Design a protein that fits this description.
Two copies of one chain form a homodimer.
Chain A lengths: L6 E4 L8 E5 L10 E6 L10 E3 L5 E4 L10 E9 L5 E13 L13 E6 L7 E4 L16 E8 L8 E3 L5 E4 L15 E9 L9 E11 L1
Bound molecules: calcium ion (6 copies).
One calcium ion binds next to loops of chain A.
Chain lengths: 217, 217
């Protein structure tokens, strides 16, 4: 009878506030009855972000929210007497904050340096390079896809390596007969690694980091 | 008797599908009685996207949603006898789709030319340039801020203009002196304009146009 629904709310809502977000329905209900709300977000830190209209059962939010700060609130609603005795025992009101894409992919282990053998077979792992993302990992908003943007130098061949778009594993793609040194200038290679958002998708957010790769004897 | 409260779903959800997005509660009705959903999205183009469990009244979606394709669904839900005849007349089930920042700002008014008289004062509106954004202007996903990225040439000053972050207005910032022809080459400055999402915060997506500004006699 007290009855009402799990509210979803996008983070980073623009002003003004407060804004309606849901509505607790009762029915079987006296006159001079009052919806009262409580729990985390009302009267437990963070106090004061959610409000119910005591007549209409309109649940409203009073300010913008941050999913990577707080991802869920569990509130409790109830109706009351003219006095304050509960004429409709308390039920749970769940609020899920919806991920918005407001974090940029960023590498956090740098500087990045891996070594590899001069004359290695294809698919030999140089190193691993995973990026971090403060957004929801179960949404496109985290979900990373990796690419190599630049190789220096561009000899013997322009792209000697290739990264796992999924795992971020750098591996060798070039034979022993060129992937060597003998008459080499700098022992090493310089790779510009990009991690992008929304799993590839033309329109992601990016983070970079240049890996330094040393050819070994 | 059927209570069907508005359902929110974020676009670009990730599989596996189907995924539960809501629930229609009724009250006051026999057994064997079955829920039945209908409308565009169900049994009318674009068909096949939402289902309802005929016993529990759980509402589910079968695949990722695109807000820019469809932003709202107008559905109808009813309870029927094993027969087929309504026993709990129809109600509306409104489904809304939460915007996710997946469209990049772009300048669709190529090309951009303005004019400004040689020896103008600080403040002269030369022109305005505004970018379009396929996302929801009520959110931050649209909500663009403006910036001048580069300017060629650089004489007299490397930055002769300023652009208003919100309004997109290009104003002159160079004297009745350091803003004059004759001492020059061709009538023109070329600027790179950037529009940024999320109200100009670093997590914004960006589009760019070139605005040619001619200096007049
Ligand atoms: Ca956040
Ligand atoms: Ca992200
Ligand atoms: Ca987020
Ligand atoms: Ca979309
Ligand atoms: Ca956008
Ligand atoms: Ca969108």
């Amino acid at each position: 009878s007290i009855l009402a629904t799990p509210i979803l709310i996008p983070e980073n809502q623009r002003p003004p506030f407060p804004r309606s977000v849901g509505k607790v329905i009762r029915s079987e209900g006296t006159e001079g009855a009052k919806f009262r709300l409580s729990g985390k977000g009302v009267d437990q830190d963070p106090k004061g972000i959610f409000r119910i209209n005591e007549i209409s059962g309109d649940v409203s939010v009073t300010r913008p929210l941050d999913r990577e700060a707080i991802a869920n609130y569990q509130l409790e609603v109830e109706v009351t007497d003219l006095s304050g005795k509960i004429i409709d025992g308390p039920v749970r009101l769940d609020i899920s904050v919806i991920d918005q894409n407001d974090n940029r992919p960023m590498f956090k282990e740098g500087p990045y340096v891996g070594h590899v053998m001069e004359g290695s077979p294809t698919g030999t792992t140089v190193m691993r390079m995973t990026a971090f993302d403060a957004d929801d990992p179960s949404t496109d908003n985290a979900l990373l896809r990796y690419n190599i943007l630049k190789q220096t130098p561009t000899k013997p061949s322009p792209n000697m390596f290739y990264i796992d778009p999924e795992k971020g594993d750098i591996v060798t793609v070039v034979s022993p007969v060129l992937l060597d040194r003998e008459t080499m200038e700098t022992p090493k290679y310089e790779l510009v690694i990009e991690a992008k958002d929304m799993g590839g998708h033309d329109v992601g957010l990016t983070g970079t980091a240049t890996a330094t790769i040393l050819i070994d004897d």
